[PDB]
Structures are given as structure tokens and as C-alpha cells.
Design a binder for this molecule. Structure first.
Ligand SMILES: *[C@@H]1O[C@H](CO)[C@@H](O[C@@H]2O[C@H](CO)[C@@H](O[C@@H]3O[C@H](CO[C@H]4O[C@H](CO)[C@@H](O)[C@H](O)[C@@H]4O)[C@@H](O)[C@H](O[C@H]4O[C@H](CO)[C@@H](O)[C@H](O)[C@@H]4O)[C@@H]3O)[C@H](O)[C@H]2NC(C)=O)[C@H](O)[C@H]1NC(C)=O
Ligand SMILES: *[C@@H]1O[C@H](CO)[C@@H](O[C@@H]2O[C@H](CO)[C@@H](O[C@@H]3O[C@H](CO)[C@@H](O)[C@H](O[C@H]4O[C@H](CO)[C@@H](O)[C@H](O)[C@@H]4O)[C@@H]3O)[C@H](O)[C@H]2NC(C)=O)[C@H](O)[C@H]1NC(C)=O
Ligand SMILES: *[C@@H]1O[C@H](CO)[C@@H](O[C@@H]2O[C@H](CO)[C@@H](O[C@@H]3O[C@H](CO[C@H]4O[C@H](CO)[C@@H](O)[C@H](O)[C@@H]4O)[C@@H](O)[C@H](O)[C@@H]3O)[C@H](O)[C@H]2NC(C)=O)[C@H](O)[C@H]1NC(C)=O
Ligand SMILES: *[C@@H]1O[C@H](CO)[C@@H](O[C@@H]2O[C@H](CO)[C@@H](O[C@@H]3O[C@H](CO)[C@@H](O)[C@H](O)[C@@H]3O)[C@H](O)[C@H]2NC(C)=O)[C@H](O)[C@H]1NC(C)=O
Ligand SMILES: *[C@@H]1O[C@H](CO)[C@@H](O[C@@H]2O[C@H](CO)[C@@H](O)[C@H](O)[C@H]2NC(C)=O)[C@H](O)[C@H]1NC(C)=O
Ligand SMILES: *[C@@H]1O[C@H](CO)[C@@H](O[C@@H]2O[C@H](CO)[C@@H](O)[C@H](O)[C@H]2NC(C)=O)[C@H](O)[C@H]1NC(C)=O
Ligand SMILES: *[C@@H]1O[C@H](CO)[C@@H](O[C@@H]2O[C@H](CO)[C@@H](O)[C@H](O)[C@H]2NC(C)=O)[C@H](O)[C@H]1NC(C)=O
Ligand SMILES: *[C@@H]1O[C@H](CO)[C@@H](O)[C@H](O)[C@H]1NC(C)=O
Ligand SMILES: *[C@@H]1O[C@H](CO)[C@@H](O)[C@H](O)[C@H]1NC(C)=O
Ligand SMILES: *[C@@H]1O[C@H](CO)[C@@H](O)[C@H](O)[C@H]1NC(C)=O
Lengths: 364, 365
């Protein structure tokens, strides 16, 4: 008798974990009305109300930034966060606009999901301040919104080449760090006018066996000088590195995602994380969560609360999807989960893993 | 009824293709004694004796380099080349050594296989020269071996920051190019002394939506030739320099898009034991994007054209491509069935049987 996949995420052994936001945070004063997951699954999630994994990479706590030290381990991984950095927030820093940060959000989750599939543990860590830091003036956003804390952007007193050393540790507590996801950011579009002349913007992360950099000294035309805050999200092995500069501008990381290694690749699972239609959302999660590294469980309805704490907590669709995490499944796929069975009532697509039933019509 | 994976590549549909070298080239004067594939499968392959996809990206024709215009389309893809750029060749250009070039080979194939999984067609194209080009002097290798023709490395007649424009086309003949695999290379390790000073080496590829760059001005003067293999959308780009050194691509792999992600298949491509091979293909061909079929024996010929054409093991493996298959995996191919007599691992695709022991009702298990 063919089985029907249950639409939503799932797990095949005990060794699974979740990463989330208010909708999976049982410490919320309105829990369990504010949850989209079953309450009994709160212990499987690393979650904080008003946070996201992207926001927490770039910022610590500020007036409208709730930063959380995300930390969890699992061969299988379910992500249900993201919404707390969306166009509703109206955030930009330099001239890149709100859409600029939705691109950076997309880049970050893309890299996080990829790196996650070869790791068990993922831990957001604070990095040590470099030793012997020269004098530094804090960077600012042109928008005067909060400058990211990571990576640090600061200004030296002079314009000559210099370098500071940062350490990506090989472990954090009992978590081994076989690699790090680290942001590399810069102000693009030519020379940057400060100290009374238009200076080259040139920064890099280097070691004996690593290089990533940016350089631009292109002159500005008339009064049109404009720069965007841009980031690339890098895979970096543990060890000691230099944050280098051709002068004036210094960029070095202050936080990273520490990850360990597991010897089998397993796609992660991401559930669409959006606001009600009162507010502006984006599709960064869906654009980041792509075969072969991520199984994306989209919503087919708006965020729709009939018995929750407010219009943005207690979506009926996601609540139904998350019931899938209560079962001990054999097959995980974009169609959802199944137990061990010969046949399926529908085609099972990729990515999938475990032992999956085959579409019954194939056997007539 | 139960099935057992047949070790070797395979195909589930009519829409498949191969990429290769002498060992799948029916134009070779010694064919079919020189083949490792069934002779009747030659028309499914884009192959040239003495070439590889890596070599052909970086070089056009020279006395030691047989460059081929690789081109083929298929949802499912079987790669069987690589050997014609191996440590046997002892190629290096600056101070990176032969190992340096094995690392670049590995980088290239990694990117090739990844990008191939969402493309149907793959076509090596000659890009047009930038329409405006100042006077240029060709770069050279310290070793005096042949400088790669792609990307071009050349020297302007002053140190003025400069850009030239290159075009990655939206199509080539009937093939649509939705993306391009393009090399970005540079000489690393500090400033480079020429024309009377130690000049910064700073080059980049830039558009309104794209930046990739390298810069170093820092103080034996040693340099390595280093490349990265970049995914780039069709369009016009600046090849920019902070002065003197100019790098721009002259060839790319043009690829289209298909709306499914299918792992590629790569078979180990090595020389006989008396020569130096590498495991770039094994290191490049990884889950989740590529299914690697390694050799378990040396390159061993009992009925072929020479000691390096007609391997018994690969010949047996390539018989898999004649089979009725519904499931393709690192264990090999099976036809449509309920149960497999052995465990099937990843990457795999199609409709795959489940491991028989999971359904045992004895229970002696
Ligand atoms: C690629 O490989 C696959 C897998 O091996 C092939 O698919 C199989 O093809 C065979 C042969 O056609 C199929 O087996 C045949 O099924 C026919 C229908 O059987 C159904 O209906 C009867 C009741 O009428 C049920 O009992 C049965 O369980 C099925 O529900 C039968 O007519 C065939 O019987 C033949 O063999 C018996 C032997 O005793 C004799 O009666 C006759 O000789 C008779 O011809 C047979 O059972 C099989 O179903 C397919 N398997 C799968 C898994 O789909 C592909 O054909 C092959 N493709 C190519 C191009 O080679
Ligand atoms: C590197 O150099 C080699 C030459 O040393 C070069 O290989 C040659 O390529 C050409 C064209 O791809 C081949 O010529 C063809 O050979 C086939 C026989 O198999 C003929 O059918 C072809 O004729 C048809 O097409 C012609 C147009 O090209 C028409 O003129 C004609 O009417 C036919 O329609 C054609 O002659 C040639 O066989 C190979 N030679 C070798 C030794 O491989 C290779 O292309 C060069 N690489 C690069 C990147 O330029
Ligand atoms: C494809 O198949 C190849 C042939 O089997 C594999 O070759 C193996 O490659 C690995 C490294 O990836 C080598 O491992 C090294 O082993 C040495 C010890 O060498 C000696 O002992 C081994 C085992 O008894 C023996 O195989 C050697 O010949 C030596 O006698 C260690 O010092 C290293 O740290 C490293 O672990 C294997 O040696 C090598 N085997 C052969 C026969 O060439 C290849 O790895 C396969 N590729 C993939 C992707 O699976
Ligand atoms: C930013 O500010 C908030 C406070 O406004 C900090 O939140 C606090 O974080 C700690 C450590 O996570 C929480 O303690 C934890 O409580 C749970 C559940 O009871 C327990 O299992 C943990 O082991 C831990 O003790 C604390 O409750 C929380 N406070 C509030 C009001 O939420 C947050 O850490 C700050 N972020 C950063 C990046 O510094
Ligand atoms: C997830 O589902 C949503 C809702 O269908 C998709 O968003 C729609 O995208 C289409 C096509 O671009 C637009 O016409 C709609 O107006 C969008 N609707 C909403 C509510 O935003 C979204 O693209 C899906 N994400 C992925 C990755 O498939
Ligand atoms: C709305 O949600 C509330 C909160 O979870 C539900 O209240 C629970 O209902 C069960 C029985 O169905 C009780 O055993 C629990 O004690 C209740 N919990 C709390 C915190 O009140 C309620 O059932 C839901 N209402 C509807 C109409 O579905
Ligand atoms: C290559 O770089 C040049 C020069 O830095 C860019 O030229 C500028 O582009 C815009 C047109 O969109 C003009 O308004 C500016 O006046 C141009 N500046 C100069 C000095 O000509 C050009 O856009 C770049 N080309 C590409 C394809 O990215
Ligand atoms: C890196 O920074 C340190 C300062 O801590 C400096 O001593 C060292 O020379 C730098 N290395 C390079 C290659 O710039
Ligand atoms: C792929 O999907 C796009 C829309 O997402 C569509 O325009 C196109 O027809 C499809 N292309 C192919 C090759 O199937
Ligand atoms: C050896 O190769 C020839 C030429 O293709 C073939 O016809 C013959 O069957 C082979 N001989 C043996 C013993 O396999």
C-alpha cells in the first residue's frame, strides 16, 4: 500500500537539530501561543525571539538588533528563521539600499546551508580582538543606522599600508572548529574621500595559504561619489590571519560561525520565514535554499494566524508542517517525510536522503 | 526481482553525453584497439586524442598542447579525461611547481562538475578580443614553458590604471550561454619588478553586478601563477588593472540551464604505472555534485593499442553505459527494481531500489 509523504521537515534519527527565532522560542512570554513548532520540540532548537542567524553574524545587541549566540549540533538540520532581517526593517548602511542587504542576506544563507551539510555542529563565536591594535576611529553608516559589529570597519589615523592579526580558533569549548564562515566586507565604487583626498579602498584577509581581497582607487566623477557596503561570506580554516590594508581603512572579523566536520554530506532543511501581509518580506531563504545542499519547504499560503499570540506568531500551515518533526521517518525529501515503505503515492524529488519509497506508477 | 549495482557509469535516458580524450576518440588511427569505451558509443562523446578539458581551457594549440573545442549536451554526463594534464607532463610556469598546477587542475574540475549539474550543454568557446586594446607585450613563464593563452597575461607600456572590456556572450551558435566558467589568474607574492620598479600586481574582473580581484604591493623575488575558476553571467565586463599588468579571459566554458540538478559522473583518468598520474579527478569529483568511479587496478592493457590505451577495468566499467538503468550511484547502475543486494550511497539519482535487509521479516537480522 503506497504511502503519502507528510509535507514538512523531518528527521531519521535522534541526531537532528533546529535553528530558529520567536516562533520556536519557548522562553517567549507568550509561549506556547507564540510557537509554530510543537512545544515539546523546543529543546531541539537553538532559537531566540527577534533574532536571526544573519543578524547575529553581523551585529551584537543594539536598540533594534536582538543578537543571539546560536549553537547547535545535528547530522540533520532544520532552519526556521530569517524574517527578523527583512525589508520591513528598512535597513541599509551605505548607498546599497534595502535591496542591497537582501542580497547580502541571500549570500549568507547560501554559504551557511552549503557549509552546514558537511558539519554536525554550528556555533556563533566571538573572536579575540587583535593584539596591538593601532589607533582607530569607529566607522559609520552614511544612513546613520547601526554599523555592523562584524566585520569591524574602522579608520586609521594615517594612510600607509598596515596589518593586524586575527585568530580563528581550532575549538570553542567542546566544539571543534574545522572551519569558519567569516564575512569579508568593504565599501565599493572607487576611491573614498577622507582626510582631505580621495584614497584607495583596499583591504584583504591573508595568510601563507589564504587570500581574499578588494581594491579600488578609481577616481570619482563630479559630485557623484557613492559607495555600497558589500560582503562576501568566506570559508576559512582555523588559524592565524592578517587583516591587511593599503591604508586608512581597516576591516577585520569579530565573530564567526565555528563548524566541525562530519564525513557524510547531508542536505539541510529550510522552512519559509516571512511576515504577515501587513509587512514587507523577502525570498532570501528560498533563493538560498537550493538543491543539492538544501531542501526548501515553502509556504503555499500567507502567514495566517487563527489561534496565536499576534498576526505574526502561530501560522497554521507551518504548524501543520512542523508536526513532521514528531515522527521517526526513513526518507526526507521536498515532498516531506515518509516511513519505511516500498511505494509512494507521488514522485519523490531531490534533494532527498534516507531510504525512500518509489513512485507506485513506476511499477504499474 | 532483486538487482545488484553494475560498477561503472550509466544512463537512465536518451539524453546523455560524454567528454573524453584518446580513449574515447574513434578518429584515432588505432581505434578501436585504442578505446576504453564501446566503439558504438563514440558518437555520444566529445573527445580528442591528447587533449583534456583543463588543458583546452588554458591553452590553444602548441607543440606540446593539443587543444580541442569540447562541446556536448546532455542531462546526464560522463567524464573520462584529465590524464593529458598530469605530473608526467612536468608543467609549471612561475614558482608554483608541478603540484601548483595539480591544485589548479583540481580547482577547475571541481567548478566544472558543480556548474555542469544545472546545465545541459557545455561548450568551450573562443571569446572575442576586447575591441579596444592598447599596445601589449606578452607575458612569459620563468620556466620558459608555454604561458597559458587563457586568461591572457600581458604588459602595458606604462603604469596608468586601465580597463579593457571583454564580452561573455549570451549564446554561441545554437547553444545558449546562461553562465560561463572563466579563469581568473595572477602572479602572487608581492610586487613584481619590471620597467624600473617593483610594481603592484592588481587585476580584477568587474561589472555593475560583479567583482573579483587580487592586489599586492608588498616587498629572491618569487611569484606563483595562481588561478580561480569563476561562475560569470553573460554580459560585458571590465578587465581592470591598477597599472602595467593586464589579465583578461580569451576562452570560457559556455553552459545553458536546465531546471533540475543532476550529478555528473567521472571515471578515474590515469597513466600506466611507469608514469606520474594524479588524483585531481578523485579530489574534484565529490558528493553532492559528482559520482566518482575510481580504478581499483593499475592502467593495465592486455588487448589494446599500447600500454596506455585499452584498460581492462575501465572497458568493463564502460559496459555499464549499454545497460538498462533507472538508478545511477557510486556503486554503479541498476534497472528499476524494489530491492538492491547491496547498499547504495550518494550521490545518486533516478528511482533507486532499497537495500534488501531493511525489509527482512526473518528476523535473523
Ligand atoms: C528494463 O528493466 C526493467 C526491470 O527489469 C524492465 O521492466 C520489467 O519488464 C518485465 C518484462 O516486461 C516486466 O515483467 C512482466 O510483467 C508483465 C505484466 O505483469 C503484471 O500483471 C500480472 C497479472 O497479469 C501480475 O502477475 C504481475 O505481477 C504484474 O502486475 C507480465 O506479462 C510478464 O510475464 C512474463 O513472464 C512470465 C514468466 O513466467 C510469463 O508469464 C511470460 O513469459 C510473460 O511474458 C512479466 O512479469 C516487469 O514488470 C518490469 N519490471 C519493472 C520493475 O517495472 C524493462 O522492460 C526493461 N526495459 C528494456 C527496454 O529492456
Ligand atoms: C588544434 O589543431 C588541430 C589541427 O592540428 C585542430 O584539429 C582539427 O580540427 C578540424 C575542425 O574541427 C578537423 O577538421 C575536420 O575533420 C573532419 C573529419 O573528421 C571533417 O569532416 C571536417 O570537414 C567538415 O567541416 C569542415 C569545416 O571545419 C568543412 O570544411 C567540410 O566541408 C566538412 O563539412 C573537417 O575537415 C581536423 O580533423 C582536426 N585535426 C586534428 C589533427 O585533430 C584543432 O581544432 C585545433 N584546436 C583549436 C582549439 O583550434
Ligand atoms: C582512487 O584509488 C587510488 C588507488 O587505490 C587511491 O590511491 C590512494 O590515495 C591515498 C591518498 O588519497 C593514499 O593514501 C596515503 O597512504 C600513505 C601510505 O602509503 C603506503 O601505504 C598505503 C596503504 O597500505 C599504500 O597504498 C601505498 O602504496 C604505500 O605503500 C600515507 O602515508 C598517506 O598519509 C596517505 O594516507 C594511498 O596510498 C593511495 N593508494 C594507492 C594504491 O595509490 C585514491 O585515493 C583513490 N581516490 C579516491 C578519491 O578515492
Ligand atoms: C543580548 O541581550 C539579551 C538580553 O536582553 C541576552 O539574552 C540573554 O541571553 C542569555 C544567554 O543565552 C539567556 O540565558 C539562557 O537562558 C536559557 C533558558 O532559560 C538557558 O537554557 C541558557 O543556558 C541560558 O541561561 C538569557 O535568558 C537571555 N535573556 C533574555 C531576557 O532573553 C543576549 O545574550 C544578548 N546577546 C548577546 C549576543 O550578547
Ligand atoms: C515561495 O512561495 C512564494 C509564494 O508563492 C513565492 O512568491 C511568489 O513569487 C511569484 C513568482 O515570482 C510572484 O508572482 C508572487 O507574487 C510571489 N508571492 C508572494 C506571496 O510572495 C516564492 O517565489 C517561493 N519561493 C521559492 C524559492 O520558490
Ligand atoms: C488555541 O491554543 C491554545 C494554546 O495552546 C490551546 O489551549 C490548550 O488546549 C489544550 C486542549 O485542547 C489544553 O490541554 C491546554 O492546557 C491548553 N493550553 C493553554 C496554554 O491554554 C487551545 O486548545 C487552542 N484553541 C483552539 C480553538 O484551537
Ligand atoms: C568599466 O569602468 C569604467 C571606468 O571606470 C566605467 O565607466 C563609467 O560608467 C558609467 C556608465 O554607466 C558612466 O556614467 C561613467 O562616467 C563612466 N566613467 C568613465 C570614466 O568612463 C564602466 O561602466 C565600466 N564598464 C563595465 C562593463 O562595467
Ligand atoms: C601581520 O600583522 C602583524 C602585526 O600583528 C605583522 O607583524 C606582520 O608582519 C603582518 N604580516 C603581513 C604579511 O602583513
Ligand atoms: C526553466 O524555468 C524557467 C522559469 O523559472 C522557464 O522560463 C524555462 O522555460 C525553464 N527552462 C527550461 C530549459 O526548462
Ligand atoms: C582483442 O581485440 C580485438 C580488436 O577489437 C577484438 O576483435 C578481439 O575480440 C579481442 N580479443 C580477445 C581475446 O578478447
Amino acid at each position: 500500500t503506497p504511502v503519502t509523504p507528510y509535507y514538512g521537515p523531518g528527521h531519521i534519527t535522534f541526531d537532528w537539530c533546529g535553528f530558529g527565532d520567536s516562533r520556536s522560542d519557548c522562553t517567549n512570554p507568550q509561549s506556547p501561543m507564540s510557537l509554530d513548532i510543537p512545544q515539546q520540540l523546543c529543546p531541539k532548537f537553538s532559537s531566540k525571539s527577534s533574532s536571526s542567524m544573519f543578524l547575529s553574524l553581523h551585529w551584537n545587541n543594539h536598540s533594534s538588533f536582538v543578537s543571539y549566540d546560536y549553537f547547535n549540533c545535528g547530522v540533520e538540520k532544520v532552519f526556521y528563521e530569517g524574517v527578523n532581517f527583512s525589508p520591513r526593517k528598512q535597513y541599509s548602511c551605505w548607498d546599497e539600499g534595502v535591496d542591497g542587504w537582501i542580497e547580502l542576506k541571500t549570500r549568507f544563507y547560501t554559504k551557511l546551508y552549503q557549509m552546514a551539510t558537511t558539519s554536525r555542529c554550528i556555533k556563533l563565536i566571538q573572536l579575540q580582538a587583535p593584539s596591538s591594535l593601532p589607533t582607530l576611529q569607529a566607522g559609520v553608516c552614511r544612513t546613520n543606522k547601526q554599523l555592523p559589529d562584524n566585520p569591524r570597519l574602522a579608520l586609521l589615523s594615517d594612510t600607509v599600508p598596515t596589518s593586524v592579526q586575527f585568530v580563528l580558533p581550532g575549538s570553542s569549548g567542546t566544539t571543534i572548529c574545522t572551519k569558519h564562515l567569516v564575512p569579508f566586507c568593504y565599501l565599493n565604487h572607487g576611491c573614498f574621500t577622507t582626510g582631505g583626498s580621495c584614497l584607495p579602498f583596499g583591504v584583504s584577509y591573508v595568510s601563507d595559504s589564504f587570500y581574499y581581497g578588494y581594491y579600488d582607487a578609481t577616481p570619482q566623477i563630479g559630485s557623484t561619489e557613492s559607495h555600497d557596503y558589500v560582503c562576501d561570506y568566506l570559508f576559512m580554516e582555523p588559524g592565524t590571519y592578517n587583516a591587511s590594508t593599503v591604508g586608512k581603512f581597516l576591516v577585520y572579523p569579530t565573530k564567526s560561525y565555528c563548524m566541525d566536520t562530519m564525513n557524510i554530506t547531508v542536505p539541510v532543511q529550510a522552512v519559509q520565514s516571512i511576515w504577515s501581509e501587513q509587512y514587507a518580506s523577502d525570498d532570501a531563504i528560498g533563493q538560498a535554499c537550493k538543491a543539492p545542499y538544501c531542501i526548501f519547504y515553502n509556504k503555499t499560503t500567507p502567514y495566517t494566524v487563527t489561534n496565536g499570540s499576534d498576526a505574526n506568531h502561530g501560522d497554521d500551515e507551518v504548524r501543520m508542517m512542523m508536526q513532521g518533526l514528531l515522527r521517526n521517518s526513513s526518507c526526507i525529501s521536498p515532498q516531506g517525510s515518509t516511513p519505511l515503505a516500498l511505494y509512494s503515492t507521488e514522485m519523490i524529488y531531490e534533494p532527498n536522503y534516507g531510504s525512500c519509497p518509489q513512485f507506485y506508477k513506476l511499477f504499474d
